[PDB]
Subunit: 121 residues, 2 copies
């Protein structure tokens, strides 16, 4: 669920998740996907496509279990969908940390409705 996602983002990036990613670019936060503005936005784009591809569970609602072993998100879910879900979230949190280097505050509160439509996942 977003509860685990939020935690992972904190774990990976050390940044407040909503402040930095609750509304950033065309893809981070609500209002679905759009053409990514930058690498960070691309994380969120990929993340949303990851969610979309999940057939067997609800990515935003469904809670799952994961661990923090050697400063690494470890998805210990036996439930296949929750496992794929956890891996979706892990991947975006890692992506977000890896792209902090080009994170641009001007993309915070980017006007999403005016984003170019996104190519399908």
């Amino acid at each position: 669920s977003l509860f685990e996602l939020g935690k992972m983002i904190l774990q990976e990036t050390g940044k407040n998740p909503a402040k930095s990613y609750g509304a950033y670019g065309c893809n981070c936060g609500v209002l679905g996907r759009g053409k990514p503005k930058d690498a960070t936005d691309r994380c969120c784009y990929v993340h949303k496509c990851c969610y979309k591809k999940l057939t067997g569970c609800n990515p935003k609602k469904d809670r799952y279990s994961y661990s923090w072993k050697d400063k690494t998100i470890v998805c210990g879910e036996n439930n296949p969908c929750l496992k794929e879900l956890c891996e979706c979230d892990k991947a975006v949190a890692i992506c977000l940390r890896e792209n902090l280097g080009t994170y641009n505050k001007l993309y915070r509160y980017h006007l999403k409705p005016f984003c170019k439509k996104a190519d399908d996942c």
Copy 2:
């Protein structure tokens, strides 16, 4: 949808809904409910309890018709759920506006895991 909600909050409060309320307190924005930090937070608490009472429609994704007439949100929507949805969003927008005077920026981007669990609606 978050579009109509965002716009109502904007019309009522005059604030960017995403920045001011996308993550405020334990109730505004993502991650369900929690013990409200203040009146503004309480609005979102009530709002989420309002959403719970809805009868099938999707508050996140479903669009509905309202008009801003004589500076009042009018839920012209006739469909039963979308009408109540609209009414939920109108109520929170008004509530946020009415409690603007105690809006506390410190609760912007409040970390949701730090919140005491919400009482049942």
